[PDB]
Design an enzyme around this catalytic site. Sequence first.
Site, short mmCIF file in Angstrom:
data_model
loop_
_atom_site.label_atom_id
_atom_site.label_comp_id
_atom_site.label_asym_id
_atom_site.label_seq_id
_atom_site.Cartn_x
_atom_site.Cartn_y
_atom_site.Cartn_z
N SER A 97 15.77 49.50 -173.75
CA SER A 97 14.50 50.21 -173.92
C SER A 97 14.20 50.43 -175.42
O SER A 97 14.14 49.44 -176.14
CB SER A 97 14.55 51.51 -173.12
OG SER A 97 13.26 52.03 -172.93
N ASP A 193 10.42 46.72 -163.59
CA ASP A 193 10.42 47.83 -164.55
C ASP A 193 9.14 48.66 -164.40
O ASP A 193 8.04 48.11 -164.52
CB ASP A 193 10.50 47.26 -165.96
CG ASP A 193 10.87 48.30 -166.99
OD1 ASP A 193 10.38 49.46 -166.90
OD2 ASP A 193 11.66 47.97 -167.92
N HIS A 223 13.92 50.03 -164.62
CA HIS A 223 14.01 50.11 -166.07
C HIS A 223 15.42 50.29 -166.62
O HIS A 223 15.81 49.62 -167.59
CB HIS A 223 13.10 51.20 -166.60
CG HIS A 223 13.11 51.28 -168.09
ND1 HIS A 223 12.72 50.23 -168.90
CD2 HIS A 223 13.48 52.28 -168.92
CE1 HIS A 223 12.83 50.58 -170.16
NE2 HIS A 223 13.27 51.83 -170.20
#
Length: 246
Positions: A97, A193, A223
């Site tokens: 991320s 995601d 995610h």
Amino acid sequence: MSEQYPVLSGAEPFYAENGPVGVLLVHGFTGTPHSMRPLAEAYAKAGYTVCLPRLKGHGTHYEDMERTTFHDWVASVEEGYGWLKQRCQTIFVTGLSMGGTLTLYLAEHHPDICGIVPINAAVDIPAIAAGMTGLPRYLDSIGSDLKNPDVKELAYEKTPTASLLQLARLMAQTKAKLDRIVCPALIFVSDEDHVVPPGNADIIFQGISSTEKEIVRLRNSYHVATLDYDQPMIIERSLEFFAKHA
């Protein structure tokens, strides 16, 4: 300037000194080393030197996070990179991320990095700009986007809006400099995601100047893929990548 709250249980950084090939692991925004720890432990067990730092303002309290800028988060990563440089002849960087954003950012500034493994990295999240426009100091955080509901992720329960602005600026700068990256890239993306739009993988793939690059699609994770069902595949494919490029 320093954090005012103590480090949360489970949010401690992880370091392991092993062989001359090192891996830097970067966690995400409002998250902690917990989200990268299984990877870090697997890579250490495989013989790699490993550095999994705790980003400034993370793993303590969201009020500490609010006092940080993206330059602080970059400094945590630069510090971990320096730790590895003092110990290793070959360095790889991986991150989830915003940790993936920081992986890209570091590679944009350090040509000596031998490969990168961004996982659901973020260089454009339109929802941030949309979120303003049309407010509060702290937003209620969304629950962790994990396909496996049994997994407990450690992340702040509120997100400072000031910090979202910092993330937006980091992403914009990272996006603008993608063509500086030429090292091999293994880009993981979860099809499903719900946080970072999966087209980010293609922004990255097309934007970097690397000749050795691929996108690996994860079909059984959301995610937070490093803790989700595709974890073993991420670990196995990453280990293969490190060995090939070391």
